[PDB]
Symmetry: C9
Subunit: 129 residues, 9 copies
């Protein structure tokens, strides 16, 4: 299989030796496998890993890193609004919101901490471009 | 096929879902048998668009947003700073509640100095960026 | 109009922005706002931002100096053995390290000011 | 007034917008004030803030920073003597001093910490000169 | 034979290595092993080590992304007020700072990858 | 007017008192109506003197004091180091009091290593400064 | 006199024993009156050998060991990582014991991210060294 | 005479120095002391300060090595299960991280010595 | 004596002045000693300390620093094996080892911490060479 070869490559990188990789795959698949069958799959995959990246592939990986950072920034921005909404409710002396959900106590430093980590994603994106 | 389909395939890959799991979830949304090589081809198209270099005004576009977002955060923290300083002055003079009626929360000097520094850090980061 | 740009930066997508105001109309305003933010700032715009920032720093520095004097007034009252001040306010506990920490943060505002004025003269 | 214009400039930098600045000054002063009256005071003060410093004014600000540091150093030096005086009394097994004041417990690291912060003010002054 | 080199690096002296296997025979094998390790590595050997390391990084990155989604799924359940998830698993407490910390460590794996691929192209 | 008046005006300004509050407090000391523009003029005179550049021997004057002050601190910490080491040796061998009669205080190895490092830091800062 | 005698004299000096204490302890091992100037002469011989500069392949000898030792540590930590991740998955789904029978220990997300980082640090240190 | 310079550096003003000894006489001695400290140091003066500092470092290094051996002797006694040593002294608890921390600080004294001797040869 | 002169040089560097050095040696040795006897021993030793190192002596001191680091590395490596041996016993649910000694609880981070400090000694040795 294709996923069988990936499972072998994963276990090798995760620290298992060919002997341990053969035992674990003998529980997954019915038919047992020898070390030469494992080592040849390694020999194929290891030469593919050693393929040096083109200059365009690094720029591709930079563009993906920025896009992944935008996704985290959107998740963190939604959390920042919840923290700030909770902070205003804490000062007003409310136990529940107008929505109905419970007010959770948030410290000023935690809001400013969350602000900095959202702003640092911008700075790193500017530095990357 | 769609505009959101292009973005959703790339989103799930960047959140750690492999091509197999992307195919299964997108089959529920867009009611078809979505193939694994279809997901990989969309990934390949996405990597080509992302590998293109940014323009000089596209850098200015991102810089302008970062500084404007910093201004929005700075006003949120500036409001928090005034509350802390108002609380400190009330605590210093032995008050439990303010004139308006809201309760006096205890604040340490180091917290006020810390909050001030974070506000000034944003201004330094603005000036340096310009 | 400015409020649309605010909600975009705070993390709300175009669809959610239309719901609060009440999508295709919103996306165009953000595209126009992109070109405004994409414009290169003038030197006189930068001089204004440096002037405002350093004046805001002086306001904070004046607030922290007022707190430094309170910490110092408390320390001498604590050391002399007083529970209460002459004016009637209570004597709060202060650690020597906190006074030095407060002094350090006041002194760094001068250093941050000098460094900003140094970089401004070159650029 | 002159202090009225400074109050407006302070509130603007502290984060208030012209609408909020007009409301707060309407409580301080009897007669209410419009936004154009506020914005024109901003327009005067903002152009004065944008005045670029002469090379002599930076040297002036350096000299003041060193003089402010000398004042803090004198306050910290007086505290260092109190810590050391207390440390010697702690070893001797005294609860009160010969003066009459109470002995307070001080750790060795706190004295050396206070020493370093006094010495760092010198180093920074030497670096500044 | 490789096991002798392992025990030497783990801190056991030649005398103790002979006791586990069962000294002069051991010292010679280490001297021969020294010359093998003293050999300069090829470029294709380095390309393999960079390929393995960055692939191992992707495996960790995929594991941490799976944990990030769990933390995020827990946070929304905690905020909405649920004790239990739909599938039957318990809702665990998550602090906002821990989610940002997890995001940061995932983002640094991209930065560490880009820096390693940048240094590889030059060398 | 006076020598201490010049210094006291500058001191209060550097401690965060504005020209108005400086005028009020100095009116009590020097028994006159001290004007705000008088305080501002003294501030202006002070800024001119401070803006003057330092001489090369004036740098050596400050450097010489900093190193001599470091020697005074080093002897204070060196005495503290011997007390900690004397305490450690007594604690190691199960003693409650010393031969002289003073009580044995508990000390950790890391504290002695920390105190030693701070003493050696002063020597590094001395050598580097020279 | 001996090979181990040369090494043992240098070892005791580097562990903080002075020439007097080295002479006393070595007199018990090698049953003679070991002189202080004999210890100092062995120290002098040792300093001459250590002062000699390293060869270019001697650097490669040490580098090769450091990377191989790093691989041995990395496999020890990689095994620990799998145990933590196996524990986390069991804790997530409300299990007290594993299928094999061993007990489920609680693990935090930050610990797994910390352990992963240390494993990746070794790979960075390997690549950089090469 | 040296005691006047000591009290000035410790933070006492000229007025307070006259009170302890028992102002215009004190200010002149400080002005004369300023010129002495203002004098540029010789190379032989610097060589003395480097020699004293590195010899003082060896004294500390010898003290920390003696403590390292005690920590190590305690660790082996703790691991073997002993409460008391052969000589009669008590076995104290030691954490592995503290032993490595102690080793690190001893090793940095060698590095600080080598760096100081390197900078001295140039200057 | 020779050790008497070293005791004087030690006490001077440890912070004692000639007056205090004379008092302490008057308790150790029967016959009391004057300050000129102390100061002349200082005068001899201080000129010997000011002897500038040859380039070979620095290389000698580097070689000793590396050899001292190897000794610590061997002590730390033996501790690492004890931590790892304990960690495996903790997972297996053993209170005592097959040897007989008690199992002590060790955290994963402490093992990886100990690993890094052993590996950092190598890195610093490579950097030194």
């Amino acid at each position: 299989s294709v996923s069988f070869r990936d499972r072998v490559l994963k276990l090798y990188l995760l620290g298992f030796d060919p002997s341990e990789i053969a035992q674990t795959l003998s529980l997954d698949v019915k038919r047992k496998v020898t070390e030469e069958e494992v080592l040849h799959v390694l020999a194929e995959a290891r030469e593919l890993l050693s393929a040096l990246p083109s200059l365009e592939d690094i720029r591709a990986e930079v563009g993906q890193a920025l896009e992944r950072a935008r996704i985290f920034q959107k998740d963190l921005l939604a959390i920042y609004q919840n923290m700030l909404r909770n902070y205003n409710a804490m000062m007003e002396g409310l136990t529940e919101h107008p929505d109905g959900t419970p007010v959770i106590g948030v410290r000023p430093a935690d809001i400013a901490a969350m602000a900095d980590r959202i702003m640092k994603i911008d700075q790193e994106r500017i530095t990357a471009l």
